From a paper:
Some bacteria express a binary toxin translocation system, consisting of an enzymatic subunit and translocation pore, that delivers enzymes into host cells through endocytosis. The B-components of the C. perfringens, [name], and C. spiroforme systems bind to the host cell’s lipolysis-stimulated lipoprotein receptor (LSR), after which the A–B complex is internalized by endocytosis. Then, the A-component is translocated via the B-component pore across the endosomal membrane into the cytosol, assisted by host-cell chaperones, including Hsp90 and Hsp70. In the cytosol, the A-component covalently transfers an ADP-ribose to actin, causing F-actin depolymerization, cell rounding, and eventually cell death.
Here, we report two cryo-EM structures of the [name]-bound [name]-pore, long and short, at 2.64- and 2.56-Å resolution, respectively. We solved two structures of [name]-bound [name]-pores: one with a long stem and the other with a short stem. The former contained one entire β-barrel stem; however, the final map calculation showed that the tip of this stem (residues 337–358) had very weak density; therefore, we modeled the structure with a partial β-barrel stem, excluding residues 337–358. Thus, both the long and short structures have partial β-barrel stems, lacking β-barrel tip residues 337–358 and 332–363, respectively. The most striking difference between the structures was that D4II (receptor-binding domain II) was observed in the long, but not in the short complex. Between the long and the short structures, the definitive difference is that D4II is clearly visible in the long form. That is, after stem formation, D4II is stably fixed around the stem. Domain 4 is the receptor-binding domain at the outermost region of the pore, with two sub-domains, D4I (T617–L741) and D4II (T757–D876), joined through a linker (N742–P756), as seen in the long-form. However, the two overall structures were similar, including a 1:1 binding ratio of [name]:[name]-pore. In both the long and short complexes, [name] was bound to the cis-side of the [name]-pore through its N-terminal domain.
Author numbering:
A (entry chain E): 299 to 336
B (entry chain F): 359 to 394
Write the structure that this text describes.
Amino acid sequence: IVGVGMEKLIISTNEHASTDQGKTVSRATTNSKTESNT
Amino acid sequence: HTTDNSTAVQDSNGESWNTGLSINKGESAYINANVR
């Protein structure tokens, strides 16, 4: 007579986690011209 | 009465960096055992 007894249960949560970080550098140059007539 | 015409050119450049890291909560590591 053979039986099976369970002692404890363990749960493995199939989950995916990500982490991102970044840096940015920029530089803009503008040379405007205007010819006003009145 | 006034009338003007505006002309301009805009120039710019960019540069960026990134770093990431991903993990699985179900299988986070693998174990190896040296036995005799």
